[PDB]
């Protein structure tokens, strides 16, 4: 049944290499290269500390690169960018702690989770899995990507204020750096924003303006990096890449004798992981390829599940981390790569290149060593607010703080609901609250259930409140 998508995309495929020779493409490549590499580094590092180096940076780098290349080539949706995520980290930590508590060879039990993943995928794919996906409404997607964008923005700010804690303002004896980090970030962000507006505002002529504005992000990055460069007397945290790659697993163990019962029972955690990757990647493909964006061509749900989680299983076998399709990263790779609304350029080459690049960052170390984190904090913040764009829920939250004097494209929605819209959006908000407290705990792994629990349940208890004309126009 997946075939529908292969048939959809493979003809477009041999066209998508020619589609890629634009400059906007190149700018996008640089932008997304950093947007993918920074979390690869950071998450890799966390992943190493948690697992005491059994599953480390270079593993995540390799996996991200290879998986990236492969999916880029064979995917139904080459705009999707595959990388590690927070949830996946939470689970790695969990499963490691458990495994080692019970004295299980962590990496092996990992492998078995992988086998189970391969199986589950073959099943759910061959038997119409994505069917369920067609029941994922906007009321879901918006709560989801707004929750994410919000968490993302929040996280970025937390990193900055961490720098402030590591080096507080005081006298003697560390100093002068917190401020400069702040400055660098603020500056980078400001320049990104400015260049964007420049790209869409009157000044300057044609290709010069559109190209300068398309390279908004890389130009910003460059400028601020030069600023840090010429400022030589004050320490700044910079991107750190391992000097060189370091660290097939035998499913019966390496230092064990891996218990047979557990190499059955790894089925449950493989269930949880499968649910995570499924939820994320699927909702993500939904938001990237929604009708509101001009891209309504060459995209499919089935191929991507098989590819992503399959890669995942194999990776698990090679002592690599499995990856899902990221929301924010993919969204911003789409916007990159987007003309204004106007058609979006659909490449296999953008993704291919950010992947390869992520791979070779090892070699790129001397370059990347000059790039101050603060700068990329700025870029992050920019991605955060940019990610906030196409979300109607956001539009409405805003619309609440706005006087009732201003109206939407659709008179129906505000006129029928001058109070009630705020209530509907209010339910959105309270859902957001719930999911934010759930995800707040180390109970957070429960979330992908809660997210469904909340929405398609709400989305049945909602017709209790308003009607098939009323509610219908809200998505």
């Amino acid at each position, epitope marked *: 049944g997946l075939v529908r998508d292969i048939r959809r995309r493979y003809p477009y495929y041999l066209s998508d290499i020619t589609d890629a020779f634009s400059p906007q493409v190149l700018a996008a490549v640089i932008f997304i290269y950093f947007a993918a590499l920074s979390p690869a580094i950071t998450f890799g590092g966390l992943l190493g500390e948690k697992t*005491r180096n059994q599953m480390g940076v270079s593993e995540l780098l390799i996996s991200t690169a290879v998986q990236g290349i492969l999916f880029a080539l064979l995917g139904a949706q080459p705009l999707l960018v595959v990388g590690f995520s927070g949830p996946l980290l939470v689970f790695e930590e969990a499963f490691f702690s458990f495994c080692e508590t019970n*004295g299980l060879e962590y990496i092996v039990g990992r492998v078995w989770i992988g086998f189970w993943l391969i199986l589950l995928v073959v099943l759910v794919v061959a038997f119409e899995g994505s069917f369920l996906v067609r029941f994922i409404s906007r009321y879901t997607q918006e709560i989801f990507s707004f929750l994410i964008s919000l968490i993302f923005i929040y996280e970025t700010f937390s990193k900055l204020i961490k720098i402030f804690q590591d080096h507080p303002l005081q006298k003697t004896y560390l100093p002068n750096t917190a401020l400069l980090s702040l400055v660098l970030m603020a500056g980078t962000f400001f320049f990104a924003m400015m260049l964007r507006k420049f790209k869409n505002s009157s000044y300057f002529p044609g290709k010069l303006r559109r190209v300068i504005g398309d390279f908004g992000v890389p130009i910003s990055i460059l400028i601020m990096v030069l600023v840090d460069f010429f400022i030589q007397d004050t320490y700044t945290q910079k991107l750190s890449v391992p000097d060189g790659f370091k660290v097939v697993i035998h499913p019966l163990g390496l230092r064990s*004798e891996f218990p047979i019962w557990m190499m059955f029972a790894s089925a449950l955690p493989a269930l949880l992981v499968f649910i995570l990757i499924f939820l994320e990647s699927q909702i993500t493909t939904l938001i990237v390829s929604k009708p509101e964006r001009k891209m309504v061509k060459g995209s499919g749900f089935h191929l991507d599940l098989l590819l992503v989680v399959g890669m995942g299983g194999v990776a698990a076998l090679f002592g690599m981390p499995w990856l899902s399709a990221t929301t924010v990263r993919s969204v911003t790779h789409a916007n990159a790569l987007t003309v204004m609304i106007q058609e979006v350029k659909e490449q296999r080459i953008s993704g291919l290149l950010v992947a390869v690049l992520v791979g070779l960052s090892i070699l790129m170390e001397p370059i990347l060593s000059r790039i101050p984190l603060a700068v990329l904090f700025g870029i992050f913040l920019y991605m955060g607010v940019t990610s906030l764009s196409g979300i109607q829920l956001f539009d409405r939250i805003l619309l609440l703080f706005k006087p009732p004097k201003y109206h939407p494209d659709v008179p129906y929605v505000k006129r029928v609901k001058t109070w009630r819209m705020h209530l509907f959006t209010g339910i959105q908000i309270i859902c957001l609250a719930v999911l934010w407290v759930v995800k707040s705990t180390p109970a957070s792994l429960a979330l992908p259930f809660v997210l469904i629990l909340t929405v398609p349940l709400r989305r049945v208890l909602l017709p209790l409140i308003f009607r098939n004309v009323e509610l219908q126009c809200l998505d």
Partner: antibody, heavy 123, light 112 residues
Framework: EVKLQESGPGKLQPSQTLSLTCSFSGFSLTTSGIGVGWIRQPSGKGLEWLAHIWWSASKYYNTALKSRLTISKDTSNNQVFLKIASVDTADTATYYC???????????????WGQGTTLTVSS | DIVMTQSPASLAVSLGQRATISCRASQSVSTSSYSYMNWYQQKPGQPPKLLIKYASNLESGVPARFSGSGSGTDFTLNIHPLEEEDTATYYCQHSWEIPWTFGGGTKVEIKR
């Protein structure tokens, strides 16, 4: 009252199979995070870890020695056992049964030690 | 697998003085926040006894004249003020990965 008690054959002919027994009390080998195993000290030397087994029945073995080692457990009678195949005179040592603890910050350290049992391999 | 090198092999130290023992690891054995190094005391004719876990954390009941420190690949045990009963062999071991291994031990003897 956490106790560990080693028992062995005292002495053993070369080429034969050593069977060691550890009996314990004051804790269960059903409890998560706890492992029981063996470390040996050759006469006038330091310490060599042999093997350990957890409630999972997963069992870690010392490389190089792995092949000659088999560890098992009788949880219901608070015992663990170690077998060493084709024993040689280099296996003459004191064999300690020690409890392993899963550290608050991960990892393990040896919590309680039996008084040990002396083994001599000689014709 | 991790190899550990203790030094000195033997140490003779006057009563009430400071005994200091070091244990080098063949690779790092610590995270950003914890170090996984243990210290044991074995008096002659006795089993080893746990003194220190996590490089510097005194195991309950262990005398405060014992103290541990270090990080990365380099670790240090201190006994001050040294007492008569402290004459013993002292062992370090890592808990970074399986197989757990021990250092070769340091015999601390009293000078009289």
């Amino acid at each position: 009252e956490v106790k560990l008690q080693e028992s062995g054959p005292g002495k053993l002919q070369p080429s034969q199979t050593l069977s060691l027994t550890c009996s314990f009390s004051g804790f269960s080998l059903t409890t998560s995070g706890i492992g029981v195993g063996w470390i040996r000290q050759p006469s006038g030397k330091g310490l060599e870890w042999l093997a350990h087994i957890w409630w999972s029945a997963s069992k870690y073995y010392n490389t190089a020695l792995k092949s000659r080692l088999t560890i098992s457990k009788d949880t219901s009678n608070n015992q663990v056992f170690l077998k060493i195949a084709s024993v040689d005179t280099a296996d003459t040592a004191t064999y300690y049964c020690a409890r392993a603890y899963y550290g608050n910050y991960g990892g393990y350290y040896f919590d309680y030690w039996g008084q040990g049992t002396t083994l001599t391999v000689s014709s | 697998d991790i190899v550990m090198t203790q030094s000195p092999a033997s140490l003779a130290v006057s009563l009430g003085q400071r005994a200091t023992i070091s244990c080098r690891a063949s690779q790092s054995v610590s995270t950003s926040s914890y170090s996984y190094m243990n210290w044991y005391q074995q008096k002659p004719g006795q089993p080893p006894k746990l003194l220190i876990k996590y490089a510097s954390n005194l195991e309950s009941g262990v005398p405060a004249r014992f103290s541990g420190s270090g990080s990365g690949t380099d670790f240090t045990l201190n006994i001050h003020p040294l007492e008569e009963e402290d004459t013993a062999t002292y062992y370090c071991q890592h808990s970074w990965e399986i197989p757990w291994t021990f250092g070769g031990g340091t015999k601390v003897e009293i000078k009289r």
